[PDB]
């Protein structure tokens, strides 16, 4: 609920470059400035003779909002012989996938083709580039000697990637072994140390890789998507991967051990061709330190009130339990054909309430297919099934849909304000947007009405003037506030009280405030962070018996408290927000004595 949508940081790339197809945060190890990484897999480059080789861009945060391409590789195609290229980098889609871990940047070209050294072929083995500091190395684990569709010739290695917490790479290639797919994990230390540009198929020791299986598993697409997390409690991140064509198109998700690539657990879809496994994510959403599994099926079809099927997509949330089992729940899309669940981004603790949160994209929802992103906050039971916020794409295109939300990355505090921030890509309009998280004010409000029971005959209180004949009591209203992160030590609150709220238009209000002689009382207030419960008293009374013959329904005293957000701003320009989970209204009720 606390993402700043009024003024996000808007970055743009070359038209037609799919700028924003992939996004990640970049944090150097020397606690230097933070940047944004953005893939533009169709961008033209200076590489000699290469058309739409694509590129990855580093983007300043706020200093300028400028983006400059990262030079992973400045060269064109190597030659096996004169007029006989060894490789084909044009339209290789470099930057289709980008990941970062401290100093390291991994970017991949899943449509990089190569020739092989024997026959003249053009096999999309895929390639990646790993850049640490000065050092950059090529990482093409599928450019092996196991050639053709039978082997890894069509593996498209790098279609999906992630880092483990122990500096292992997890790489997916959905094409290996007649599109069975394959997962490969290599130590970054091996990737750089064994690199030799004279050797096209590098022997990496301690490599982990799924193996070729029976032909029944062909066309499964293992490695279509990957995430990492520990699921046997040995501290070693394990490998999660989507397999969306498996089980005769029901879809599956495989989990393998991150130490020996042994099979650990399986999930299976419920519906044919829902593309169960298009996306996967691993994050502890309920605070038990056990990683939980999110799986997206963006083409899943729900049944409606009219009994008609409607493609809305669906996400499954599987809480890991110490017993090794999983506790699964589903979460359906809201708009038809919006493909809810195409992207799932762990956000960290967006509202800093003690539970991690998550964003789920419906990239083709909203008006004119401008895209939508849904924020789901976590809690001890699991994931709150109602989104606390909805981000709406603002740009329209004329060729391919904007696809706002097709890629996302969160869980990084780029403005060092104590709350993680979110990147959203929109490759169809060549745009990437940063949303910064506003700090959250929690408020404890109290309302006391003494005496509670009210007797009409009893009149020891005096009205302004000489009337001196009313039955009375008093209302005490208090607010207390605090927060976490960058905030000022003073806040302006606007409190409003309303006597006898239960009665609506056209109905008499039995209780009125003494001074005003009206049931509404307003009040500005000032409260300091971490201060004591600052209270205030006032006095009210009842009307004459003749005016209301309703002495049964209880009189409810209603208190509402809002905030002035502009006055609490910060150097960032980022105003705080009240915690939505704490209701900003409180009510107490008083009754009439009966004789």
């Amino acid at each position, epitope marked *: 609920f606390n993402l700043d949508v009024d003024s996000p940081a808007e970055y743009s790339g070359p038209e037609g470059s799919y700028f924003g197809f992939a996004v990640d945060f970049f944090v150097p190890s020397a606690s230097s400035r933070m940047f944004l990484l953005v893939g533009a897999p169709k961008a033209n480059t200076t590489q000699p003779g290469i058309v739409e080789g694509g590129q990855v861009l580093k983007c300043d945060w706020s200093s300028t909002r400028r983006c400059q391409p990262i030079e992973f590789d400045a060269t064109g195609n190597r030659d096996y012989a004169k007029d006989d290229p060894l490789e084909f980098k044009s339209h290789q889609w470099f930057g289709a996938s980008v990941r970062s871990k401290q100093d390291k940047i991994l970017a991949c070209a899943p449509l990089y083709h190569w020739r092989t050294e024997m026959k003249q072929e053009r096999e999309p083995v895929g390639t990646c580039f790993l850049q640490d500091g000065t050092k950059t190395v090529e990482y093409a684990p599928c450019r092996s*000697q*196991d050639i053709d569709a*039978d*082997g890894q010739g069509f593996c498209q290695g790098g279609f999906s990637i992630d880092f483990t917490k122990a500096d292992r790479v997890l790489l997916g290639g959905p094409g290996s072994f007649y599109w069975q797919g394959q997962l490969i994990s290599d130590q970054v230390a091996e990737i750089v140390s064994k690199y030799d540009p004279n050797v096209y*198929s590098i*022997k990496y*020791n301690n490599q982990l890789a799924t193996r070729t299986a029976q032909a029944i598993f062909d066309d499964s697409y293992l490695g279509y998507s990957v995430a990492v997390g520990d699921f046997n409690g040995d501290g070693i991140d394990d490998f999660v991967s989507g397999v969306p064509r498996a089980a005769r198109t029901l879809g599956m998700v495989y989990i393998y051990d991150g130490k020996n690539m042994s099979s650990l657990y399986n999930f299976t879809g419920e519906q044919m061709a829902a593309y169960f496994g298009f996306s996967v994510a691993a994050t502890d959403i309920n605070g038990d330190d056990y990683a939980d599994v999110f799986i997206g099926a963006p083409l899943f079809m729900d049944r409606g009130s009219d009994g008609k099927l409607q493609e809305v997509g669906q996400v499954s949330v599987s809480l890991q339990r110490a017993s090794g089992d999983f506790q699964t729940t589903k979460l359906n899309g809201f708009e038809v054909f919006a493909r809810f669940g195409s992207a799932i981004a762990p956000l960290g603790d967006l509202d800093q309430d003690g539970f991690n949160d998550i964003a789920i994209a419906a990239p083709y929802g909203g008006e004119d297919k401008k895209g939508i992103v849904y924020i789901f906050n976590g809690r001890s039971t699991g994931l709150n099934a109602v989104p606390s916020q909805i981000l709406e794409g603002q740009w329209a295109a004329r060729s391919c849909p904007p696809s706002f939300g097709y890629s996302m990355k969160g869980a990084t505090d780029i403005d060092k304000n104590g709350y993680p921030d979110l990147i959203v890509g929109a490759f169809g309009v060549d745009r990437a947007i940063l949303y910064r998280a506003r700090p959250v004010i929690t408020v404890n409000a109290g309302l006391e009405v003494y005496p509670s029971i009210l007797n009409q005959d009893n009149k020891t209180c005096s009205l302004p003037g000489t009337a001196l004949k009313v039955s009375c009591f008093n209302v005490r209203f208090c607010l207390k506030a605090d927060g976490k992160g960058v905030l000022p030590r003073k806040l302006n609150f606007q409190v409003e009280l309303l006597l006898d709220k239960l009665k609506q238009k056209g109905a008499i209000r039995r209780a009125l405030f003494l001074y005003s002689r009206s049931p509404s009382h307003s009040k500005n207030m000032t409260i300091s962070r971490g201060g004591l419960m600052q209270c205030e008293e006032l006095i009210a009374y009842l009307r004459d018996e003749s005016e209301f013959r309703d002495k049964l329904t209880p009189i409810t005293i209603f208190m509402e408290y809002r905030l002035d957000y502009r006055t609490a701003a910060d150097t960032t320009g980022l105003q705080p927000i009240l915690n939505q989970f704490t209701p900003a209204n409180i009510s107490r009720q008083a009754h009439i004595l009966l004789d």
Partner: antibody
Amino acid sequence: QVQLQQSGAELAEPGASVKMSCKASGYTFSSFWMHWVKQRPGQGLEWIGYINPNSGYTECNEIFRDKATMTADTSSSTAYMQLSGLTSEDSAVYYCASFLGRGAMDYWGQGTSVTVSS
Amino acid sequence: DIQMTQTTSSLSASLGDRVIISCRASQDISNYLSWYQQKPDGTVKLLIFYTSKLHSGVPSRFSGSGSGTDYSLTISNLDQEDIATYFCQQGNTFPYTFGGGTKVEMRR
């Protein structure tokens, strides 16, 4: 840390056959071809052929087309060669060697001596 | 097939000397010639591939040269462990063929 461990010396009578092994470690066995080489005592090196371990496809020198047959067990990272119709000219050391690429062979096993006598 | 011939089957050298071994192919092999070292115990190591590329782990003393049909392996500052037989191998076309071998022995 690539290592190819070959089986021990084989003895066989003329006309019989032998089967020798070659277990790989330190790299992904299935992703690299395995070559075999013949060296008669005091003689030079003779190339027999190679096998794609993951697919079983092989190519042989015309010489050994009917002599040798190469196989591979991916689950154990082991390559096998079988010499059939043995003679005294088959008595030699037989090496396995992984494929560097660039038409070279980067790591060699220790060799398996084969002796053919009655 | 491609015939590979190492004219000198044996040469003698002293420690620190520079040794040059010659290899000739019966056809243009387009720089796909590799050099291997075999020590008396049978051990075989790859030294050079693609005419002049050092294999991981072998020392800088070894270096390779050539093109077309003529090639040469060069050992600079020969070591005691260098005494071994050196073969040359073309990898441009199947079947792979080796040279006869050149044996490097110490001088006395």
